[PDB]
Paper text:
Polycomb repressive complex 2 (PRC2) silences genes through trimethylation of histone H3K27. PRC2 consists of four core protein components: EZH2 (catalytic subunit), EED [binds histone H3 tri-methylated at lysine 27 (H3K27me3)], SUZ12 (provides a platform), and RBAP48 (7). Associating cofactors define two PRC2 subclasses, of which PRC2.2, containing AEBP2 and JARID2, is the subject of this study.
In this work, we present a 3.3-Å-resolution cryo–electron microscopy structure of PRC2 bound to a G-quadruplex RNA. Notably, RNA mediates the dimerization of PRC2 by binding both protomers and inducing a protein interface composed of two copies of the catalytic subunit EZH2, thereby blocking nucleosome DNA interaction and histone H3 tail accessibility. The G4 RNA is not nestled into the surface of the protein, as is typically seen for RNA-protein complexes, but instead appears to be separated from the protein. The RNA density is in closest proximity to the EZH2 SANT2 domain (residues 353 to 362), EZH2 CXC domain (residue R532), EZH2 SET domain (residue N697), the RRM (RNA recognition motif)–like domain of SUZ12, and an unstructured region of RBAP48 (residues 92 to 107). First, the residues within the CXC domain of EZH2 interact with the CXC of the second protomer to form the dimer interface. By contrast, in a nucleosome-bound PRC2, the CXC domain facilitates the catalytic activity of the adjacent SET domain of EZH2, specifically with R566, K568, T573, and Q575 contributing to interactions with nucleosome DNA and the H3 tail. The disparate functions of the CXC domain in these different PRC2 structures are seen by the superposition of our density map onto the nucleosome-bound PRC2, which shows clashes with both the DNA and the H3 tail. The RNA-induced dimer simultaneously inactivates two PRC2 complexes (no H3 tail binding) and evicts them from local chromatin (no nucleosome DNA binding).
Residue numbers in the entry:
A (entry chain B): 425 to 544, 556 to 687
B (entry chain A): 59 to 124, 165 to 174
C (entry chain D): 3 to 91, 108 to 160
D (entry chain A): 579 to 742
E (entry chain E): 139 to 169
F (entry chain D): 320 to 410
G (entry chain C): 75 to 441
H (entry chain F): 182 to 232, 238 to 295
The structure:
């Protein structure tokens, strides 16, 4: 005997109450599960796309069946192939580099006795596909160990600083040029320390000395040095050294 | 520039030999003409990404602070 | 044939579903089931005889001689350490299949049969006509 | 550190904040926000909702990860931005002072993709670094490779329940 | 009595010419 | 069948693997003995265990001499699996 | 008082089975002379192809669907693979997924996902068939090089749009891009800069297997022009009328305006130009509901815009002072839906309007 | 809730599987006559051995032809055999995706 | 009703997948 009843449920509003023609048999797999515990566990494990909430019946067993809402059944291979263009996804033609990952599924199960009361993971490494912050495109492992893609002075910030400086009305052209050059240098090096500012000035003539000489804004540069000395930081010795280095660039 | 190149024509969608149970799309003309039914081919799924809006990269904070009778009258 | 490609795609989907089903039943089929995704595919695998059993630790350390199969990069002769749950009870011990040594290898490694009389010497079959017998002891770890 | 303050490079000279300005691995640890030495974050779809920031390399407990950069706005402008942003139910607003709020909506760093969690893996400390209040993200506990970064959003001026 | 699970699945997976008719061709939908 | 390796901790145990993406464990001592119809449907009585944890072809596999019934199998999917068959199978 | 120049009659009227509103229609302007006039339609989860014949015999050549997800296609754009001359259809919407369908093989050739919201318009570079422009709801307009599957540039940022970029248009020669957004702004990004040539050449000369570094997509944070005083509301569609600009808003009119003052050359315009002079407004009625793009023929002789009631207006642009005249209004007692989009064949003989009731309408010029 | 994991089968694979299943049900009668776990093969007399009769079943290249007497032919005009009992050499022909070597390719060993 | 069709399809997808798997696994 052992009449088994299946009650398929969708949104709890539409139901289809059935009865297994072959008792103690998997309706999908056509497998002979001789014990109701074995049948329920096989349904729960092999046919994981459904959920089986055993509810018991006065005559036999009533198994309510519903579609597994979550059922994480995504691609289990290399996450890159989930976004490769058609014709190259799941190519399997050659070796593909992937970020290492370690999984432990079964370690030491308890192996308890069978019981109907039952019917009332660890991963190490990168376990997903990463995307670029800028372009929102998938990130290949070859571009992972380097290129953090977040640096001190973004190009938009530099362009905005240049535009803001050049957008002033009460400023000379060469003075605007030297101000923009100093701002770009500071952003490129990210000085935050007053003492470093001294060395900063030298670095300026080590990177913008030729540009200033070609632009012929040396007088404006030394005016900027004087203003900086007035704002503290740098020094008379620093001003002299920077100017002499600038003069040596012209003689070179 | 367009006058060059070959350019190819399209065909009709035949019944998919790889999909007998494929769906069918029916288009009905109101101004007479026979109703046409074609096999509704299915596009391959493409994995999507979560919806995020545009933003700019940053490393330090960024302070944000938030009749026309003049020329005509003069001419007159 | 386009039909062959369509069958390949359907087979890939079915393989994914079958792997998901098998992983659902992994606890009921195996005692220990540890899956690690190497950076490069390995064409060879042979446990080294040496096993380390640290006192007071619930695991043991074994050495695996894995090859490398790089599409265009530098191929290697990986020797990795694997932690096994021993007899009773690991839950979380951080890295478990981390590598130990890596020797530069011209071309992908086809075999990694270690010398049995002295596991220091490990042989490898290069894609060329010459066979290389490495020695992970003499070579630098990096 | 006791005053919730980053070491001023001009004053603190023994702790190493001033020394090795061009180099890395500073001797002092209360200087990471000022020096901008942040941990490499990664962007991926979050396991909770939307996008999430993932950390590339393991980080010890109470270690600097990144600064919650953004656009400095006043409280009233923060209210206006919140009224605007309530449409799509995701607020990046972050309290900085009694009159300043850091809004990482229009501009910010990768640390902006951190999801609220009742058991967060990170926490936020607003420290006055070189005279300017800056929000720093530190690991609440030990963090493993590839772990998703969370931090409780109850510290933010915007209510967590208001948006999500 | 209320149909059978295997026959119900056979009334689900094929719904075309090769549906074997039988009770599947009968009022299977809407009970 | 690309690789066959006899178990080192047992005399009548042999495992085979190849392009079939399966690793099968054969108990030679069980060959030719009568099986139930369900057992016949599942497979030959000689067959002891079928390992279906790999997506691509098994490139190679090996037993660990320091452990009784654990196997490391590497596939072309850049996946290395160290697995031990359940004790209930071989008592 | 001239009664325009073009008279149209309704010769066919189709209806898609899905019954959901269909949003975009695009004639295949890359078809050779004498090739049957193939046009595509996008609506709900299905994209349908049709072939136009004599006497309105519209033949449903092909049809596609994406039932694996809840995609709602919003726009279509035609191109061709110059390697094989196969026509290619680019579709996107709702999901922000760009699919380059190949009607020859009836397969989705390429898929592109970088956008953070629904894509509202797709246009192709007139000179380069592999440059696809996508204006999405993520406040950004991207440029894809579908030949190499790279992101050429992103046209949003600090000075970009503050809301959805509803539509965009190329210049006739394909040099300047105008983008209309939901933030009431019409920013004029310029693909004429040497930076644009560098980006396009690098994208064409980018091989992912050669280098580990990704392609450096250009981030054009600052438009070469921007304005917000043209429309008191958001701008649905924009179109380049040579060096002029046509834009449409909720104000029941499409205005023709030009950046700078009346004598200001478009090419020689500074990014800080804060002046815009309008020339004329094409006044229609009952087009308040947003996202009803208009279209003009290839020769730009005339342009047509749909309506929410069901009427169809077309204006002749050859007539002196096109802001004048009374246009030609095409109506039908069976057309009561809202025309989401219209399209003209390469020769402006067939005008096809797609309604919001999944009913395609074909109009032919009486001539 | 937790994000939808984007099931891998999608609709194209599902449509192909549906077509294959419909073909299988129309050919082998697996669902109806096979009780959901068997393939029903219809034999047809081809040659007569006057010393039995040779019969070939409806699914071609699945089971080899056999020699049977006239009474045996009448008794077993239709043979129902479980899939587990199918010859492994030719059982794969019942469906293209019953087992396909996914990396057909080349090179390798 | 359309709800019945939606339920039938939503159960047909996994039912079809598992029936193909049942056919394939026995071989
Ligand atoms: Zn200090
Ligand atoms: Zn210090």
């Amino acid at each position: 005997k052992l009449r088994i009843f299946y009650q398929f449920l969708y949104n709890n509003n539409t139901r289809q109450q059935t009865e297994a023609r072959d008792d103690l048999h998997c309706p999908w797999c056509t497998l002979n599960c001789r014990k109701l515990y074995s049948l329920l566990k096989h349904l729960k494990l092999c046919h994981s796309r459904f959920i089986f909430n055993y509810v018991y019946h006065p005559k036999g067993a009533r198994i309510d069946v519903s579609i597994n809402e979550c059922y994480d059944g995504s691609y289990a291979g290399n996450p890159q192939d989930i976004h490769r263009q058609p014709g190259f996804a799941f190519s399997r033609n050659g070796p593909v580099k992937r970020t290492p990952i370690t999984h432990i599924l079964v370690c030491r199960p308890k192996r308890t006795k069978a019981s109907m009361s039952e019917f009332l993971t660890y991963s190490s490494g990168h376990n997903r596909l990463y995307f670029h912050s800028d372009t929102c495109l998938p990130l290949r492992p070859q571009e992972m160990e380097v290129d953090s893609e977040d640096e001190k002075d973004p190009e938009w910030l530099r362009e905005k600083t240049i535009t803001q400086i050049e957008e002033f009305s009460d400023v000379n052209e060469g003075e605007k040029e030297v101000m923009k050059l100093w701002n770009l240098h500071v952003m490129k090096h990210g000085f935050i320390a007053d003492n470093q500012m001294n060395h900063a000035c030298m670095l300026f003539v080590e990177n913008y000395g030729q540009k200033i000489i070609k632009k012929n804004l040396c007088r404006n540069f030394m005016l900027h040095l004087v203003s900086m000395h007035d704002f503290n930081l740098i020094s008379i010795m620093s001003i002299d050294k920077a100017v002499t280095k600038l003069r040596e660039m012209q003689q070179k | 520039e367009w006058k060059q190149r070959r350019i190819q024509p399209v065909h009709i969608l035949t019944s998919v030999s790889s999909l007998r149970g494929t769906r069918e799309c029916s288009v009905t003309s109101d101004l007479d003409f026979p109703t046409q039914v074609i096999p509704l081919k299915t596009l391959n799924a493409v994995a999507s990404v979560p919806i995020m809006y545009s933003w700019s990269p940053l490393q330090q904070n960024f302070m944000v602070e938030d009749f026309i009778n003049d020329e005509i009258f003069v001419e007159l | 044939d386009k039909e062959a490609a369509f069958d390949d795609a359907v087979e890939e989907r079915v393989i994914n579903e079958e792997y998901k089903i098998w992983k659902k039943n992994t606890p009921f089929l195996y005692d220990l089931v540890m899956t690690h995704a190497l950076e490069w595919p390995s064409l060879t695998a042979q446990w080294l005889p040496d096993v380390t059993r640290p006192e007071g630790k619930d695991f043991s350390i074994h050495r695996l001689v894995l090859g490398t199969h790089t599409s265009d990069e530098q191929n290697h002769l990986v020797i990795a350490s694997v932690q096994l749950p021993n007899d009773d009870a690991f839950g979380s011990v951080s890295g478990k299949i981390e590598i130990e040594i890596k020797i530069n290898h011209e071309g992908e490694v086809n075999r990694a049969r270690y010398m049995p009389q002295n596991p220091c010497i490990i042989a490898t079959k290069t894609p060329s006509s010459d066979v290389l017998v490495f020695d992970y002891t003499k070579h630098p770890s990096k | 550190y006791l005053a919730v303050r980053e070491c001023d490079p001009d004053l603190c000279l023994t702790c190493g904040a001033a020394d090795h300005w061009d180099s890395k691995n500073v001797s002092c640890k209360n200087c990471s926000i000022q020096r901008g030495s942040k941990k490499h974050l990664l962007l991926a779809p979050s396991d909770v909702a939307g996008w999430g920031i993932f950390i590339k390399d393991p980080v010890q407990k109470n270690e600097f990860i990144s600064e919650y950069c953004g656009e400095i706005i006043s409280q009233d402008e923060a209210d206006r931005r919140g009224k605007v942003y309530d449409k799509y139910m995701c607020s990046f607003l972050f309290n900085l002072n009694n009159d300043f709020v850091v809004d990482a909506t229009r501009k910010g760093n990768k640390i902006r993709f951190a999801n609220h969690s009742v058991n967060p893996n990170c926490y936020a400390k607003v420290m006055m670094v070189n005279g300017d209040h800056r929000i720093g993200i530190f690991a609440k506990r030990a963090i493993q490779t590839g772990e998703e970064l969370f931090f409780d959003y109850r510290y933010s001026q915007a209510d967590a329940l208001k948006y999500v | 009595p209320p149909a059978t699970q295997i026959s119900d699945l056979s009334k689900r997976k094929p719904k075309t010419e090769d549906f074997l008719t039988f009770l599947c061709l009968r009022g299977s939908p809407a009970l | 069948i690309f690789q066959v390796q006899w178990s080192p901790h047992n005399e009548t145990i042999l495992a085979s693997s190849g392009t079939d993406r399966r690793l099968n464990v054969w108990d030679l001592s069980k060959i030719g003995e009568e099986q139930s119809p369900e057992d016949a449907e599942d497979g030959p009585p000689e067959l002891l265990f079928i390992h279906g944890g790999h997506t691509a072809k098994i490139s190679d596999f090996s037993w660990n001499p320091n452990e009784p019934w654990v196997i490391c199998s590497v596939s072309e999917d850049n996946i290395m699996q160290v697995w031990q068959m359940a004790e209930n199978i071989y008592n | 008082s001239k009664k325009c120049k073009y008279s149209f009659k309704c010769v066919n009227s189709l209806k898609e089975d899905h019954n959901q509103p269909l949003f975009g229609v695009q004639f295949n302007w890359h078809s050779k002379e004498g090739d049957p006039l193939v046009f595509a339609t996008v609506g709900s989860n299905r994209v349908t192809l049709y072939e136009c014949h004599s006497q309105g015999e519209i033949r449903l050549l092909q049809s596609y669907v994406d039932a694996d997800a809840d995609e709602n296609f919003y726009t279509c754009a035609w191109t061709y693979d110059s390697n094989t001359s196969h026509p290619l259809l680019a579709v996107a919407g709702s999901r922000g997924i760009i699919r380059i369908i190949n009607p020859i093989t009836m397969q989705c050739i390429k898929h592109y996902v970088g956008h953070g919201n629904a894509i509202n318009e797709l246009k192709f570079h007139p000179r380069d068939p592999n440059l696809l422009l996508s204006v999405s709801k993520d406040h950004a307009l991207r440029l894809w090089n579908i030949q190499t599957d790279t992101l050429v540039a992103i046209f949003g940022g600090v000075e970009g749009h503050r809301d959805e970029v509803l539509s965009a248009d190329y210049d006739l020669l394909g040099e300047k891009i105008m983008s209309c957004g939901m933030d009431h702004s019409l920013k004029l990004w310029r693909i004429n800069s040497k930076r644009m040539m560098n980006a396009i050449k690098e994208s064409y000369d980018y091989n992912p297997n050669k280098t580990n570094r990704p392609f450096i997509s250009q981030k054009i944070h600052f438009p070469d022009f921007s304005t917000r005083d043209i429309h008191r509301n958001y701008v649905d569609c924009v179109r380049w009328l040579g060096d002029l600009i046509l834009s449409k808003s909720c104000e029941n009119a499409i205005v023709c305006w030009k950046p700078g003052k009346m004598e200001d050359d478009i090419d020689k315009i500074k990014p800080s130009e804060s002046n815009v002079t309008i020339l004329g407004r094409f006044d229609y009625s009952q087009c308040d509901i947003w996202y009803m793009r208009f279209s003009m023929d290839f020769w730009q002789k005339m342009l047509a815009l749909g309506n929410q009631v069901g009427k169809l207006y077309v204006w002749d642009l050859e007539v002196e002072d096109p802001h004048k005249a009374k246009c030609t209004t095409l109506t039908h007692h069976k057309c009561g839906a809202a025309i989401r989009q219209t399209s003209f064949s390469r020769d402006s003989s067939i005008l096809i309007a797609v309604c919001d009731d999944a009913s395609i309408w074909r109009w032919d010029r009486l001539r | 809730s937790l994000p939808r994991p984007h099931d891998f089968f999608d609709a194209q694979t599902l449509d192909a599987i549906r077509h294959r299943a419909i073909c299988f049900n129309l050919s082998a009668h697996i669902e109806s006559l096979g009780k959901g776990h068997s393939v029903v093969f219809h034999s047809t007399v081809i040659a007569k051995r006057k010393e039995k009769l040779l019969l070939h079943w409806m699914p071609e290249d699945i089971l080899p032809d056999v020699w049977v007497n006239e009474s045996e032919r009448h008794q077993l005009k239709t043979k129902v055999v479980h899939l587990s009992k199918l010859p492994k050499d030719t059982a794969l022909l019942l469906d293209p995706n019953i087992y396909r070597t996914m990396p057909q390719k080349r090179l390798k060993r | 009703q359309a709800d019945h069709e939606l339920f039938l399809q939503a159960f047909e997808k996994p039912t079809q997948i598992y029936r193909f798997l049942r056919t394939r696994n026995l071989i």
